[PDB]
Every structure is written in C-alpha cells, then in structure tokens.
C-alpha cells in the first residue's frame, strides 16, 4: 500500500556470492524485503528464483 514493490533492472549484474541473484537489464523483480537499504530480498519474475540484489541497480515500475 503506497509503497511500490515491482522493480526493473537498469544494468546487467553477475552474482558474486551464493546469496545474490544475477540478472539482465530489463528483468523484473518482486521485492520481498527492502528494510536493509543496500541489499534487497527479491524474486525474479523471469526465473522464479529468490535471492538478494543491489538496490542501486534497479528502478520502480508501473
């Protein structure tokens, strides 16, 4: 409510660790938790996979 949770990747990113997600620019994400500020927990609408993503790499859509 009020807060937007659908995001789009602005750049390509390759997971560095076992916890983070890799993605293509243009890939959409449902955000599961954004309370930490640097790393957000999310789900890829493309693979159905779950994991962390850098918040500075994605932008709000719709």
């Amino acid at each position: 409510g009020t807060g937007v949770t659908l995001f789009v990747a602005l750049y390509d990113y390759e997971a560095r660790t076992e916890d983070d997600l890799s993605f293509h620019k243009g890939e959409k994400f449902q955000i599961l938790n954004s309370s930490e500020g640097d790393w957000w927990e999310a789900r890829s609408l493309t693979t159905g996979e779950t994991g962390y993503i850098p918040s500075n790499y994605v932008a709000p859509v719709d």
């Binding site: 750049y11 560095r16 660790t17 916890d19 983070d20 930490e36 640097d38 790393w39 927990e41 962390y52 850098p54 918040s55 500075n56 790499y57």
Partner: peptide, 10 residues
C-alpha cells in the same frame, strides 16, 4: 543480505 559492498552504480 551478502556484505561485501554492492558495487557502485555504473
């Protein structure tokens, strides 16, 4: 949350 810093934006 990985912490090892998100790399700066391009």
């Amino acid at each position: 949350p990985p912490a090892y810093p998100p790399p700066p934006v391009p």
